[PDB]
Design a protein around this ligand. Sequence first.
Ligand code: YBA
Lengths: 412, 556
Amino acid sequence: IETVPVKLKPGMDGPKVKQWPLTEEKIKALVEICTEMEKEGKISKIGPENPYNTPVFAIKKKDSTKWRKLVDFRELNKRTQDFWEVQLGIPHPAGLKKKKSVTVLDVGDAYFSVPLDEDFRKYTAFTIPSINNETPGIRYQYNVLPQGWKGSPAIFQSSMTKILEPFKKQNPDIVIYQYMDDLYVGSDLEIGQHRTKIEELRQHLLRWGLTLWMGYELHPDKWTVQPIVLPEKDSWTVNDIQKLVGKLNWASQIYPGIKVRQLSKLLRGTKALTEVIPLTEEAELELAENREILKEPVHGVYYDPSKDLIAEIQKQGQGQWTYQIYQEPFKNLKTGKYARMRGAHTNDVKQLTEAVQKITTESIVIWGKTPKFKLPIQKETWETWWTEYWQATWIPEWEFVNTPPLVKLWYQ
Amino acid sequence: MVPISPIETVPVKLKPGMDGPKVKQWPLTEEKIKALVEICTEMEKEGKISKIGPENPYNTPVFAIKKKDSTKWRKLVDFRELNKRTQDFWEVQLGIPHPAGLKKKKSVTVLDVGDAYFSVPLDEDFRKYTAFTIPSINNETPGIRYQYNVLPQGWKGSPAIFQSSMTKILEPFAAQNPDIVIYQYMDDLYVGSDLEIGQHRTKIEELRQHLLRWGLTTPDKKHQKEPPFLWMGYELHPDKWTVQPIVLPEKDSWTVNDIQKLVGKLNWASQIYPGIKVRQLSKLLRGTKALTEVIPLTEEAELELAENREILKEPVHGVYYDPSKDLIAEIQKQGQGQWTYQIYQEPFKNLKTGKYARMRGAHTNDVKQLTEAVQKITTESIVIWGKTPKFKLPIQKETWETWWTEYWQATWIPEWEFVNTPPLVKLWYQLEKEPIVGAETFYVDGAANRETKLGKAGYVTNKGRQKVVPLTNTTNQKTELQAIYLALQDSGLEVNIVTDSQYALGIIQAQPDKSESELVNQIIEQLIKKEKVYLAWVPAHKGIGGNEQVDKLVSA
Ligand SMILES: NC[C@H](NC(=O)c1ccc(-c2ccc(C(F)(F)F)c(F)c2)[nH]1)c1nc(CO)cs1
């Protein structure tokens, strides 16, 4: 019931990020939520001698009609101590990504029972904004461990293992991983059976609240990395071979022995784009060898936990979005495609926002950290609207791509 | 005596790793010394300051400015060195309330509490750093030493500690008087209500007594203002608001000053006067950096100000906000990357107006600019009214649908409807997704010599048509564009174009409708004339006979 001593890194002041404007209904929701949190001692009002600030907003999570508060602790997380004192955080379970099913359980409400270092509380300051700068902003600071802070799972880590030491004692087949306010539970188990062991944990978490009700069902193994495909045709136009040669030349940056000599020789002469060309036997051979080259994975593609992960996203149209996760260019650690059943037939930014959340989820499962996104969207459009469709309690970093990349063709 | 409730003290520290101020007291004339001891004597016996001993090593200089007109002397402490050493405070001062956000209230009173900041106690542990010295006559005695017991003026933390304390005190009065509203900005208290003027001044009277409970004196017999009032460059009237009437300066050789005091002042007019344009006067600025340099007015400037000396002729007013009615925002394209907008709830009665200027960009189009302006008005509306307005846009629903479904970026504008007020935002060209059967295929290429800057651009087609043009003072990137221009210029209404220029693709795939480059603009004008254009890309130096038999033609 006592403090864990928490510092920042020397040479770094606390976060002083400005609160962005909020709709009237979001302010109202935050006032009601924070009034109850104040009554329960989780937060307390603060005076103007606290110069720190972290933005806050409010959303609605998946399949629920009640506002929830989210604090954008991204800046504070950068400035927070790294928690590898006696136990360096939580080593990532490489076995979680190879389980047939993984389910995500919100365990964040358990952080609200463990006090936070009274010396550190001043750094968690946030502001409920007023409309039109009419009233001053209502200022709070956290007394308990805050959701969205990277220190919260690190501090609760020791007290979380006792909570699961009975569960993983009974079920050594199950891999449980904690990231931020989420519990990731995976197993090689049958689908109906995997759901059964899960609320066994949910009931097992209520027993210790004496001294969190729905589930997201990921499937890591039912998914795989993605190869480069080449068309299979019986008649090729000039255009067809031109696109083929372009894709092969692009793939030759990733795979070494890719050759285009015999196919590009077919493109010599100034023929109509829609004219059919028979394939040279040497060209048919070259296309065949290129295919087998593309069936093996890239050689020497290694994950380096010392370097950032970068995620690129391309809008392909009709609700389809491609993406790649890499650390070095031309060295994809995962690629994928996300299409419909998103609810945004007419909203590009909702689809992109949901794509960002899913890619981050996959990235948390595989490596235990979030990637830096390169988003195909203007900064002004994204920063205006992404909080309208955000549902996760973590937030990644992102930059913006203003020049249309040629590679959208090759990943289509 | 009715007892006073103590105002809670805000703990204050100095910046980490910083001592206190130690500044010497400047030599004052004998008459000024006389005034300062007079002033400090009354405020000492008012409990505001107190003499300190020889212990306190900190010192802040103090001056006395005889006020103008009034034959009085008023005191001045220059806290600049102490402000540098004091901790940073929380910043509520982020914005200035906009008149169009105020709701229409029947009765509204405003009370200046420029008095009350001095009845607020200062943190005792911090008063030792407020020390100052009254220099004695002829410097023959030790200067009388003083320190502050309450929030000093000109001090860093005074405005934030004063407003924080005032908000604390106002909470239960507002909470238990929901039939009023109390806004608090700067040194003023805004109190509005929808009850009859009788019960208003009673609740005003009740508030002043509520503030007496903490020892904060309030203006009474008049001295508190009622609308209308001149405030922050606005004119707030009971039913309407407007900019302060503020009239353009006149010069024949216009300085930097001259329009730095005019676009900043034409920007002010644009928030209620519709259609104010500023561009042909701001180009005369960013291309200069001298705060006295003179610039003659360009030919399009005296045409634009002649319209700024034309909208500023009749008074136009804004209405206050009605939360029960919908918020409407309407946008008009003005030309040269200029956009004007009006926000209203009823026709003919704007809450406010405004403008948006394109971003500095190498290339652009109308849709991206309209999209950006929608985002600016969205954020401005959230700030002012707490909600997103419904938009009326000069773009057809099918134009927007084709745009966002085919644009390579993700894009979105909130709920909106088409308003048919030209000039309408349009898609000026649309590239084909597949090659065109029966259209001539132009294989284009260009190349330049980095040294001589001579180059060639041209094409070869499937019908045997060919052209190569010699060029001077050009780059590889320019010749690649010029090759495409030639093919567009020399082809029929439908044409397939094959290029290896990733530079050209990057420009055209971004779909500009206007450019800085005079060459890109020619290409755009040619695209607009076409019926179908399919632009294909192939990798260079693979000898793809189009981009080979014309690569061997443009480098020869
Ligand atoms: N600087 C002059 C000083 N104030 C004013 O005149 C003033 C007039 C109107 C507002 C005003 C309007 C709107 C807001 C809000 F933001 F709430 F919408 C607000 F906070 C204040 N202020 C005063 N001096 C005396 C003489 O003792 C009386 S008033």
